[PDB]
From a paper:
Crystals of Pc VP8* bound to H1 or its precursor LNB were obtained in a third different crystalline form and the structures of Pc VP8*-H1 and Pc VP8*-LNB complexes were solved to 1.8 and 1.3 Å, respectively. Two protomers of VP8* were present in the ASU of each of these crystals and, remarkably, only one out of the two protomers showed a bound glycan molecule. Sugar binding induces negligible conformational changes in the VP8* since the structural comparison of the glycan-bounded and glycan-free Pc VP8* protomers showed minimal differences (RMSD 0.22–0.35 Å). Pc VP8* binds H1 and LNB in a pocket formed by one of the β-sheets and the C-terminal α helix. Only seven residues recognize the LNB, contacting the N-acetyl-glucosamine moiety via L167, W174, T185, R209, and E212 and the galactose moiety via T184, T185, E212 and N216. The N-acetyl-glucosamine has a major contribution to the binding since it is inserted in the pocket while the galactose acquires a more superficial position. In this way, the N-acetyl-glucosamine ring is packet between W174 and R209 that define two faces of the binding site and the O4 and O6 oxygens mediated hydrogen-bonds with E212 that it placed at the bottom of the pocket. A close view of the relative disposition of the precursor LNB moiety in both Pc VP8* complexes after superimposition of VP8* proteins showed some differences but not so for the interacting residues. If, alternatively, the N-acetyl-glucosamine moieties from both structures are superimposed it becomes visible that the galactose moiety occupies a more solvent-exposed position in the LNB structure compared to H1, explaining its weaker binding in comparison with this antigen. The atomic resolution of the diffraction data and the high quality of the density maps derived from these data allows modeling accurately the ligand structures to observe these differences. This observation indicates that the L-fucose moiety induces an LNB conformation more suitable for the union to VP8*.
Numbering used by the authors: 225 to 386
The structure:
């Protein structure tokens, strides 16, 4: 179809390897939840502009959790909350401060890639897993699909907008 394929409505699916999923967050709270139920749990939480430090509730992987959040920018903030085993408390692994409200997740090269840092200079980073194929995602906002070969385009969107 189009190289920027979408938008698609919120759903749950197992992303194929080699394709960036670009999610256009349009509200606060949980953007997506992704797990293989074995060694990888990531949830992305959206925090609106100028939020003083506070503990908010988020339902993730079916359970209500309290996360400490803040955002001292005009830009939107996206926190990666992770755990690698079912018994561990989630920790804030990475952040993305963004004027464009776009977050990205990719299966490639054996590991999960996401964007982090601050637009317009956000960059990618990897996360290891021993069960990449098992990782599914529940996405709560509209999203697009872009091949990994076209990451330069994905990077422009993340940093500069659609
Ligand atoms: C060195 C390399 O090829 N790394 C790949 C990643 O792409 C790089 O991403 C940085 C930002 O993090 C720069 O844009 C650099 O030019 C890119 O080469 C890529 O994000 C991941 C996932 O597709 O694959 C790495 O191999």
């Amino acid at each position: 179809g189009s190289m920027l394929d979408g938008p698609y409505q919120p759903t749950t699916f197992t992303p194929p390897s080699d394709y960036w999923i670009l999610i256009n967050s349009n509200t606060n709270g949980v953007v997506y939840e992704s797990t293989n139920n074995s060694d990888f749990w990531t949830a992305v939480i959206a925090v609106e502009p100028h939020v003083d430090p506070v503990d908010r509730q988020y339902n993730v992987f079916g359970e209500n959790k309290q996360f400490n959040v803040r955002n001292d920018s005009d830009k939107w903030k996206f926190l990666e909350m992770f755990r690698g085993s079912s018994q561990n408390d989630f920790y804030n692994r990475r952040t993305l401060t963004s004027n464009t409200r776009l977050v990205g997740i990719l299966k490639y090269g054996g590991r999960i890639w996401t964007f982090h840092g601050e637009t317009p200079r956000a960059t990618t980073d990897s996360s290891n897993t021993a069960n990449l194929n098992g990782i599914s995602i529940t996405i709560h906002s509209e999203f697009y699909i872009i091949p990994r070969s076209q990451e330069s385009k994905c990077n422009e969107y993340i940093n500069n907008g659609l």
